[PDB]
Design a protein around this ligand. Sequence first.
Ligand SMILES: Cc1cc2nc3c(=O)[nH]c(=O)nc-3n(C[C@H](O)[C@H](O)[C@H](O)COP(=O)(O)OP(=O)(O)OC[C@H]3O[C@@H](n4cnc5c(N)ncnc54)[C@H](O)[C@@H]3O)c2cc1C
Ligand SMILES: Cc1cc2nc3c(=O)[nH]c(=O)nc-3n(C[C@H](O)[C@H](O)[C@H](O)COP(=O)(O)OP(=O)(O)OC[C@H]3O[C@@H](n4cnc5c(N)ncnc54)[C@H](O)[C@@H]3O)c2cc1C
Lengths: 484, 487
Amino acid sequence: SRAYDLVVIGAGSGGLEAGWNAASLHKKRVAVIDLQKHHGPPHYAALGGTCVNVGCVPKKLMVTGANYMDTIRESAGFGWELDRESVRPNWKALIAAKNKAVSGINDSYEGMFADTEGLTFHQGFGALQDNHTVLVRESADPNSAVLETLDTEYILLATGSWPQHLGIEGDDLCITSNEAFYLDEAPKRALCVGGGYISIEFAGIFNAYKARGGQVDLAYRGDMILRGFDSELRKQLTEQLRANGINVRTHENPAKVTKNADGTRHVVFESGAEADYDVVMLAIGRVPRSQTLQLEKAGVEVAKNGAIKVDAYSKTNVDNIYAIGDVTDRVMLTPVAINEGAAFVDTVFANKPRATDHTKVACAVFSIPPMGVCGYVEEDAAKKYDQVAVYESSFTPLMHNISGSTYKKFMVRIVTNHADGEVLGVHMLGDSSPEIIQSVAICLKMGAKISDFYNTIGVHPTSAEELCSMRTPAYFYEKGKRVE
Amino acid sequence: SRAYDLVVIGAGSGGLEAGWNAASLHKKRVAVIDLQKHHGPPHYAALGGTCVNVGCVPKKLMVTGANYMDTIRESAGFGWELDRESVRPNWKALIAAKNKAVSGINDSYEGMFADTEGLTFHQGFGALQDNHTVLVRESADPNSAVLETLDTEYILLATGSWPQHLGIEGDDLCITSNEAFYLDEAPKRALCVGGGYISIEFAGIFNAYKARGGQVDLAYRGDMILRGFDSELRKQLTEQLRANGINVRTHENPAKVTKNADGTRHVVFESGAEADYDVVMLAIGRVPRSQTLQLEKAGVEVAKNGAIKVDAYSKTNVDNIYAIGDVTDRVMLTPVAINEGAAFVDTVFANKPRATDHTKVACAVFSIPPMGVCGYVEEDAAKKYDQVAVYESSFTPLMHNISGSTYKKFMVRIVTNHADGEVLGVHMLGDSSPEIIQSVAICLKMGAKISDFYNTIGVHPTSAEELCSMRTPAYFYEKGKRVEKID
Ligand SMILES: Cc1cc2nc3c(=O)[nH]c(=O)nc-3n(C[C@H](O)[C@H](O)[C@H](O)COP(=O)(O)OP(=O)(O)OC[C@H]3O[C@@H](n4cnc5c(N)ncnc54)[C@H](O)[C@@H]3O)c2cc1C
Ligand SMILES: Cc1cc2nc3c(=O)[nH]c(=O)nc-3n(C[C@H](O)[C@H](O)[C@H](O)COP(=O)(O)OP(=O)(O)OC[C@H]3O[C@@H](n4cnc5c(N)ncnc54)[C@H](O)[C@@H]3O)c2cc1C
């Protein structure tokens, strides 16, 4: 009666969440398809998804490793004595540790499969034959052998994204975040291309594990890194990355990349400037991975960028085909993907239609120092509200007056509908800002006003307490006009 | 008009808050009185309060310093190679840096007076002659040169608390937290006596800067440390302190302390056990400091413990006399004192009456690892509601599988009113919990329900997103009784 109730193409953040719930909560027959069961080349992403394999999880362990550079230095101010010149970072050991951590998660995923009735794993490239037939092929090649044919009621596309490349000569000389997780040795000289959070987090990792004398450049075609983040936080972070040895190059981009005789690369920038590096990592952006799904065989509509068009309930134009996650180019974050997956199951296997709310979604940038952001940026709120008030506060935590890192300022900016004092967005820069922003997200989701913040008794001493001592605005926007 | 509109006895968190406001916001003549204007012996506290001089500020700087011991060690899992046997704590460097830090704040406070017409600093022991006259004597002795008299409309008593002593033979060979901030060398062996947060935070500061081979014991007469904090957290913190070398000695109390030839202290416990230590620190409590204010002259009613009885608006029994901060013995934390100080200026000077809410105040304990809590512990909620749900989650963060400090579990416990799901209390144990608890406090203020928490999209990866992943109760309390499920 149709072999399967569900066929999920992609065992990622969204796919596993949708699959597990349908199998377990609604006892459906679910086939989940993915390229491999363990992280690593050639596919990189595997059972568990981009996050577990080549994303959030390994990035966090690496950024954590990267942080010890700073703390070893800063411990001096507090009377900690050690042979500082003997200190050496071992990348090879970091990666070893990380690999063991990732494989362990991969392995736990397999157990889940054995532990669940109706949930089965199928290896191979999934593709569509029509709206009820999912092919499982040995390669992405549209005419490689078919390993399996899956007859199904519903189809859930959850294939993720993939690293964008630039069309320049030598692009094949560059690596992406995927390969970066497997580098044999830390580059001494490195170039991260791209102004987004992934580029920035990698400059930070490289910057700490590089050999004495190394250098990390960060190129970005635009005028200021992290497009879309609070502009004031953007300039500030630029300054602190610079304070730590990262050469931030706005208005730069490779034009040609050539391999030198020693292995190293050579880069010629659109400026005319040239430079040589051990590794050139593109982190220009991510693009929806729907190119080999044969979506046309089912009549599924897609956009110029390959994103599968979905409605609030993640349904494509074909009623029995749903699509969640990065492949939908809505909000490319794991928790969002997971929510959309849970909502999908509610919607189809429980008749309780739920749409994921893609607003007030908080996020963090694990740069060193990290960012924790949520809600509107001044600019956007200004174009949607009468008059908005912007509150701002900065300070150098006391410990940093003693540690050496005087450049390390903590900043909190809050944006509000000045008419009713509703908090439209809260943006912070400084350690702990990712942990802090989570609960702030609950506030924003609840409709919190600025008087809800300053009326809560502070916790002292913490950085977070600054959130509660902001009673007067710095300036305003009246009709998109920058006022007072 | 009288000489002054207000005279503030105590230039601390609350007093200074009130003084500056009445002065800089209503343009009133306000005199503020403190014993000294720079931190240190013999009075320890000074202009800026207990927090600034020998409390919050220096204890946090010194806990940060203490953390480096775990940080340096944990760095190995992540590939940091260094001569491990070369790591050495230098206590005198820490003390000097803390000293430069505090003096600087002591200085800024000074500047604040120079630039506030109306705000005036006086120096000595403020005491009362009558309800409109306060004396600033030279010393605590009533037989002291009355340095000055100040005629005044309103009096604000904001003198704080002071370490509590034991009355045992040898108490004078012991120290309290005031002296601990000035020790010349880290003790190799130390006895922290007390179960509250000051004793715990100090046990971890000493545990970190001690000479190797050294040892820190925490002794507490009670059954479990942190009386008044979540029971599970209390249990879990104890094991984590034990994991890092601290000897938690429960049902233990010094019976007598004599002096050793080498100048260490020999302590005989009520149990009969005996041990030697370099420093015996008493952190058994803090008593409200109202004993030398001559309240009997202005007729202010006082508790048995010396607490100065006030009403919701902090007014005493004599209508022109207010008391705020630790001396009222309500919630002894800086932000509460500050909040009570601003409440008072609104009430008296702007006729906009305000009562500080002493409910749902978030607080943190800077132990290693730290705690951050807000709201009711489940035992109190069960007395008030017929059905209460307790949600729980604990996980070893991943970084701790690599760092090797495998014992550092993050624990999140939420207690709700099951009738409608209102969050009654949130309690966390783990790194970053002081920071996370601040925003949670904002939710609780607003009346958040558990649904509000789990309907929020998480930030990944963080320890905090765990707050948004708890949808099923662990157990409940039905009419005060613990139950596995509501029947
Ligand atoms: C370096 C990096 C760091 C990131 N850090 C964070 C972070 O800290 N926090 C955060 O929230 N987000 C982070 N993200 C983003 C996050 O990983 C994604 O948003 C999220 O994983 C999207 O999940 P998904 O379910 O859409 O698909 P994915 O998790 O990407 O999984 C899709 C799966 O489908 C498989 N697949 C693709 N095509 C086929 C096919 N034809 N047949 C079979 N299987 C196929 C892929 O192998 C993949 O495993 C990061 C991303 C990157 C690249
Ligand atoms: C070790 C330690 C750590 C602490 N850590 C924290 C923490 O991390 N976070 C937190 O919120 N709280 C903490 N506290 C508590 C916090 O310091 C107090 O709750 C707060 O300072 C109380 O403020 P107050 O205004 O009541 O009085 P205080 O700040 O104590 O100020 C009272 C002032 O009055 C002066 N004074 C007293 N008597 C007289 C007199 N007769 N004449 C003139 N002047 C006089 C005193 O010198 C003192 O300066 C800590 C306390 C201690 C002891």
